Amino acid sequence: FAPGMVSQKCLLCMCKLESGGCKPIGCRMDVGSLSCGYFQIKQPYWIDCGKPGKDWKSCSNDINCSSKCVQQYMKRYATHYRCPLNCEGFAREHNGGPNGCHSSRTLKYWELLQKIPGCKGVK
Amino acid sequence: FAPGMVSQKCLLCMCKLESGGCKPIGCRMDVGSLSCGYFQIKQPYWIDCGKPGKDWKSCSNDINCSSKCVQQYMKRYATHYRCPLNCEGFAREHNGGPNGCHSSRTLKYWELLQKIPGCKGVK
Numbered sequence: 001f002a003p004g005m006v007s008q009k010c011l012l013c014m015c016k017l018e019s020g021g022c023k024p025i026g027c028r029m030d031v032g033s034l035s036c037g038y039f040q041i042k043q044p045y046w047i048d049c050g051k052p053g054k055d056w057k058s059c060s061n062d063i064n065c066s067s068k069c070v071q072q073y074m075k076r077y078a079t080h081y082r083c084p085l086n087c088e089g090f091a092r093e094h095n096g097g098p099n100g101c102h103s104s105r106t107l108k109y110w111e112l113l114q115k116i117p118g119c120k121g122v123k
Numbered sequence: 124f125a126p127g128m129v130s131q132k133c134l135l136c137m138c139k140l141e142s143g144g145c146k147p148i149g150c151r152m153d154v155g156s157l158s159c160g161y162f163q164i165k166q167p168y169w170i171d172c173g174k175p176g177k178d179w180k181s182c183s184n185d186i187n188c189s190s191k192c193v194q195q196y197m198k199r200y201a202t203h204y205r206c207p208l209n210c211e212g213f214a215r216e217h218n219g220g221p222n223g224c225h226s227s228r229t230l231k232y233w234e235l236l237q238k239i240p241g242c243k244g245v246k
């Protein structure tokens with residue numbers, strides 16, 4: 001995956017959770033909007049992460065572009081919103097948005113992520 | 124698995140997700156609570172499902188007892204809270220509690236369950 005603050009092990013866990021084993025699955029409807037690809041990235045997220053690649057959907061289905069987006073989203077928001085800079089923090093940002101790490105709701109996502117084999121207590 | 128409203132296919136899918144391939148893995152602390160066994164049953168859940176078997180942890184590590192608990196939990200709550208009585212409803216109850224089927228947070232769990240081999244479109 002693309003380098004950055006989110007660890008390779010953390011990204012792999014997130015990818016396995018979002019797309020069912022880390023696969024370029026395209027877009028699925030959830031909470032009234034489409035989430036796409038390896039990391040199930042929504043359109044506003046892709047806009048915020050600096051619009052990497054050709055476009056939202058093609059980026060989402062590319063392991064390098066989609067992970068670059070995740071890295072850049074965390075660079076933008078996990079820092080600004082003073083999240084813990086670890087997999088739990090990043091996972092909660094990914095699921096909850098710019099201040100997801102401070103929303104109790106995102107703990108269910110972190111719980112689920114750790115059910116993925118090899119992902120218990122990932123940093 | 125134990126008989127009841129939750130289909131055998133649904134239970135297998137839930138079991139595979141919860142314990143990394145449906146195994147009596149005992150208890151783990153994710154997010155500040157101990158969850159145990161095949162279906163990663165927490166203690167209040169086991170109390171609510173009618174305390175089947177000898178105790179919480181032994182029940183949780185037993186394929187019949189733990190699935191009996193799931194069945195009885197749904198009999199208690201999925202009915203009362205007017206959930207859809209299908210794998211989606213039951214999976215979301217399991218993930219989110221008595222009214223989990225009406226919480227958006229439990230959707231990620233349902234989305235992941237469906238991506239387990241054999242589990243696409245499970246009812």
Ligand SMILES: CC(=O)N[C@@H]1[C@@H](O)[C@H](O[C@@H]2O[C@H](CO)[C@@H](O[C@@H]3O[C@H](CO)[C@@H](O)[C@H](O)[C@H]3NC(C)=O)[C@H](O)[C@H]2NC(C)=O)[C@@H](CO)O[C@H]1O
Pocket residue numbers: 035039040041042043044045047048094095096097098099
């Ligand atoms: C992987 C993924 O798509 N995750 C989803 C989250 O992105 C989403 O949270 C929402 O994210 C957007 C995009 O970052 C947030 O909008 C931004 O908010 C910041 C801070 O207020 C603002 O400065 C930006 O202008 C704005 N960007 C745009 C393009 O509008 C939005 O606030 C987040 N929503 C919430 C409720 O926190 C969540 C929730 O929809 O879902 C994830 O799946």
Ligand SMILES: CC(=O)N[C@@H]1[C@@H](O)[C@H](O[C@@H]2O[C@H](CO)[C@@H](O[C@@H]3O[C@H](CO)[C@@H](O)[C@H](O)[C@H]3NC(C)=O)[C@H](O)[C@H]2NC(C)=O)[C@@H](CO)O[C@H]1O
Pocket residue numbers: 158162163164165166167168170171217218219220221222
């Ligand atoms: C498999 C598993 O352990 N699932 C977890 C859920 O059980 C848990 O949700 C919480 O479940 C408990 C037990 O059913 C809920 O407490 C019950 O609430 C009902 C209705 O309010 C009440 O009648 C019962 O007396 C009460 N039981 C006890 C023993 O207190 C509790 O409210 C649920 N919590 C929430 C937030 O809804 C969720 C929590 O996220 O985790 C699952 O893993």
Ligand SMILES: OC[C@H]1O[C@@H](O)[C@H](O)[C@@H](O)[C@@H]1O
Pocket residue numbers: 202205206207208209
């Ligand atoms: O599957 C049957 C269930 O469907 C739901 O849409 C209803 O709200 C429940 O009351 C009903 O028991």
Ligand SMILES: OC[C@H]1O[C@@H](O)[C@H](O)[C@@H](O)[C@@H]1O
Pocket residue numbers: 128129130131208209210246
């Ligand atoms: O509503 C749930 C039910 O759906 C039916 O279509 C299936 O045949 C049952 O196995 C399942 O329990």
Ligand SMILES: [Pt+2]
Pocket residue numbers: 029030032033034
């Ligand atoms: Pt849609």
Ligand SMILES: [Pt+2]
Pocket residue numbers: 029032033034
């Ligand atoms: Pt749609």
Ligand SMILES: [Pt+2]
Pocket residue numbers: 044
């Ligand atoms: Pt949004």
Ligand SMILES: [Pt+2]
Pocket residue numbers: 101102103104
């Ligand atoms: Pt917090």
Ligand SMILES: [Pt+2]
Pocket residue numbers: 107108
């Ligand atoms: Pt929770």
Ligand SMILES: [Pt+2]
Pocket residue numbers: 152155156157
């Ligand atoms: Pt503990």
Ligand SMILES: [Pt+2]
Pocket residue numbers: 167
């Ligand atoms: Pt609880």
Ligand SMILES: [Pt+2]
Pocket residue numbers: none
């Ligand atoms: Pt509780």
